[PDB]
């Protein structure tokens, strides 16, 4: 007789529903703790799954160590399990594939196998607005990228160089952090100066003079509010009836409103030129099926493009200054190249002359090797994926994570990888090189292979289209920094470690350097 036992299941259920509140909340905690632990041990025997990093807390997973020190986490997991392994992160399973094979597996994955917008839309759609980037099918994104890349031409860069130069000189003249007509030395926090210089230079060139003029007013604080809404917290908590979220949504509406105002003023006056990215998208933003982007979608695409470029570029010029601050030898070598290429300063800097500055471009290239601004790129797996030359299957509903910034730091691919050495790029100063066959996904021919161990701009359909703009901006900025200033660390300070929590690998601030004028008597003209 088992019937007697099934009575005691029923009895035990009734004795359970009647335990003291102390016993039950303790049971409410301990039942999923134990179940999680036993599920992982059962998981460890599936041979069609990559090894899964062990974690104590359910749902949270390895979120803490991953969020704080992702590269240290990857190295420890790589020593234990090899190059492919999974970990739990705030409710999701992330499968990491380290190394060049990982780059191929993720960046060159079939469109049907993985979805970037399914991973990212919750981060970005609340910040940028609807209908663009990741709030739209991949085919729409592919053509959005074509539209933006159409104002990112060599001819556009030739006109952007003197405009970016003007902004840098105006920032040296007017900003409280410098005031070079009044002060010959000073101390700056590069995490204060570089965000400002980046937004001023990117606004003037990509958005135009009107939009740049608005950053001289209270309007600039909307950018700070919108910027604060770009945060990993959006991945778990993208809308909370709280104040941070309200200034974000307000800023998005107010900034996109300002761009639509300009777009509609330009069209009401037929004042549509080739000045900036606004002119360009107004003339060129009709999809191949004949649908035109709305003025709202144009404005939102501007926000996302300007904000993406904001955080990668500002982080990078911060790291460049910070590495050069302890390398007066490198500053000296870069200064000599400035003097030779620009005839002692008697040539005005042009886009063409920037391309004849290999050591300056190698300094950018080397900073992007040691400080890849995005430590992790993500996709959501949409169809079960087999990992070649293994028995592993990554099931739909998992996410795949690739980290070229981690391979940038491996000695096997970059000897003495933790040493800043711009000369490892001698006779190889190009921002990136397609090492063979090319493919076009809708925004131009790009490298078909994505196996390069140096992959600062990703690859495949989601590859960056901002690299030449970033080199132009960083190049103008650094050419002027080098010709105008020397700089060094306060006593006993050195390169700060990265803060990875922002998802952008920023220097831990305050990161202070001391500048001094190379020509204490040099004056910057213009009105102020
Ligand atoms: C140092 C500067 C930069 C670095 C290292 C960088 C890095 C990257 C990487 C790694 C990706 C691939 C993302 C993924 O696969 O999920 C990407 C995509 C992209 N980036 Fe950049 N970026 C930089 C600057 C810029 C700038 C200046 C702009 C705009 C002016 C920009 C706009 C974009 C866009 C539109 C994409 C396409 C995303 C997609 O197709 O899903 N980036 N970038
Ligand atoms: C999604 C986002 C990101 N941020 C942080 N970790 C991983 C990421 F994928 C990012 O790739 C960053 N970025 C890349 N180039 C410039 N910015 C991005 C892409 C396109 C865009 F229009 C705006 C934008 F923020």
Numbering used by the authors: 7 to 534
Report text from the authors:
The pyrimidine ring of VCZ occupies a similar position to the non-coordinating triazole ring of FLC but projects further into the substrate channel. The 5-fluoro substituent of the pyrimidine ring projects towards Y126 forcing this residue close enough to interact with the heme ring A propionate (2.8 Å; as seen in complexes with the long-tailed azoles PCZ and ITC). The key water molecule (743) is present and forms a similar hydrogen-bonding network with the phenolic hydroxyl of Y140, the heme ring D propionate and the tertiary hydroxyl group of VCZ. An additional hydrogen bond is present between the 5-fluoro substituent and the key water 743 (3.0 Å), which is shifted slightly towards Y140. The water molecule corresponding to water 790 in the FLC structure is not present at this position due to the projection of the pyrimidine ring. However, a water molecule (750) seen in complexes with the long-tailed azoles is also seen here. It forms hydrogen bonds between the pyrimidine nitrogen (N1), the main chain nitrogens of H381 and S382 plus the carbonyl of residue M509 which projects into the binding site cavity. The water-mediated polar interactions between Y140 and the tertiary hydroxyl of FLC and VCZ optimally stabilise the binding of these drugs.
